[PDB]
Design an enzyme around this catalytic site. Sequence first.
Site, PDB file in Angstrom:
ATOM      1  N   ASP A  72      -6.231   6.622  -4.851  1.00  0.00           N
ATOM      2  CA  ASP A  72      -5.717   5.260  -4.934  1.00  0.00           C
ATOM      3  C   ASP A  72      -5.786   4.859  -6.414  1.00  0.00           C
ATOM      4  O   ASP A  72      -5.990   5.720  -7.262  1.00  0.00           O
ATOM      5  CB  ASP A  72      -6.479   4.313  -4.000  1.00  0.00           C
ATOM      6  CG  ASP A  72      -7.901   3.988  -4.487  1.00  0.00           C
ATOM      7  OD1 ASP A  72      -8.343   4.398  -5.577  1.00  0.00           O
ATOM      8  OD2 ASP A  72      -8.607   3.311  -3.730  1.00  0.00           O
ATOM      9  N   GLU A  75       0.812  -1.217   0.000  1.00  0.00           N
ATOM     10  CA  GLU A  75       0.000   0.000   0.000  1.00  0.00           C
ATOM     11  C   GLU A  75       0.845   1.267   0.000  1.00  0.00           C
ATOM     12  O   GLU A  75       0.368   2.304  -0.402  1.00  0.00           O
ATOM     13  CB  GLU A  75      -0.987  -0.019   1.190  1.00  0.00           C
ATOM     14  CG  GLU A  75      -2.008  -1.201   1.148  1.00  0.00           C
ATOM     15  CD  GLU A  75      -3.054  -1.014   0.054  1.00  0.00           C
ATOM     16  OE1 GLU A  75      -3.052   0.057  -0.601  1.00  0.00           O
ATOM     17  OE2 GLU A  75      -3.919  -1.888  -0.121  1.00  0.00           O
TER      18      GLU A  75
END
Length: 162
Positions: free
Chosen positions: A20, A11
């Site tokens: 994202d 991540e």
Amino acid sequence: MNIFEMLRIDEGLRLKIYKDTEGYYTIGIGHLLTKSPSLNAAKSELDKAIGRNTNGVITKDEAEKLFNQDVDAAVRGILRNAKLKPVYDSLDAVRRAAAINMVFQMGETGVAGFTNSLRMLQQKRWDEAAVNLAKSRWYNQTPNRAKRVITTFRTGTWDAYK
Ligand SMILES: [Cl-]
Ligand SMILES: [Cl-]
């Protein structure tokens, strides 16, 4: 290696609100804020998450606090889910981390849609699960991360992460 270090690699860490891979406002270690296109909606979800007026920026301690909560929530979503729980219980410790990684990324409903893969995982047909896991939007949209997670299910080792 463990689930925390695995997710931190997959991540990243960003201390300011970012989009994202799907274009959704996110902060920290993959902590999704909102699917809404509104940065003001994100900032308000963020203040509520942290409990203070952040103006879109958080500290590293705060990022790690959300991360701990999100890992815990992912684990609890697996154990509460009648389709995920028996698969997870059947798995060794390393492959359990792969399952958590998937739930963390795509949510318990998303993973519970991998009905055929879950069955192969439960039966420990590793090479077959790995083939089936890859026939997915997941794999086509984020191939490098999906490959690392699939390799973890296939081998039961941390090799893709070292
Ligand atoms: Cl939260
Ligand atoms: Cl990726």
